[PDB]
């Protein structure tokens, strides 16, 4: 099961990005879709399922790609994107 | 991005 079930809703995750500092650079819509919510501190986000945290986002970073890069064992990632997608990033 |  998810590490943080309360952030399992994509809509709730999107709402967390109201004061996201990097709107143009990495869209909240893509971050929320990829399982991440904004902690509210700097550009630190966390996945609701694996609880993996990512920060120091660079312009044009792709949330799903970074999810797979750093947390390839996440079951939300696997269910959403499939194993082939994860394997290809590695 | 990087982990924290
Ligand atoms: Zn995850």
Ligand 1 centre to CA of A46 (Å) is: 8
Ligand 1 centre to CA of A24 (Å) is: 23
* Pairing of the two strands B2-3 and A45-47: unpaired
Residue numbers in B near A52 (CB within 8 A): 3
Domain boundaries in chain A? 1-90
* Pairing of the two strands A36-38 and B2-3: unpaired
Q: How far apart are CA A11 and CA A15, in angstroms?
A: 6
The two three-digit tokens of residue A15, written as one number: 């709402």
Cα within 13 Å of Cα(A85), Cβ side? 16
Q: Name every residue in A having a CB less than 8 A away from some CB of B.
A: 44, 52-58, 61, 66, 70
Q: State which fold the A1-90 domain adopts.
A: Inhibitor Of Apoptosis Protein (2mihbC-IAP-1); Chain A (1.10.1170)
CB A54 within 8 A of CB B1: yes
């Amino acid at each position: 099961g998810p590490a943080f079930p309360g952030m399992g809703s994509e809509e709730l995750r999107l709402a967390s990005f109201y004061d996201w500092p990097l709107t143009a650079e990495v869209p909240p819509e893509l971050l929320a879709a990829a399982g991440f919510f904004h902690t509210g501190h700097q550009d630190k986000v966390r996945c609701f399922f694996c609880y993996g945290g990512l920060q120091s986002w660079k312009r044009g970073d792709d949330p799903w790609t970074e999810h797979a890069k750093w947390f390839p064992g996440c079951q939300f990632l696997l269910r959403s994107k499939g194993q082939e997608y994860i394997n290809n990033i590695h | 991005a990087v982990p924290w």
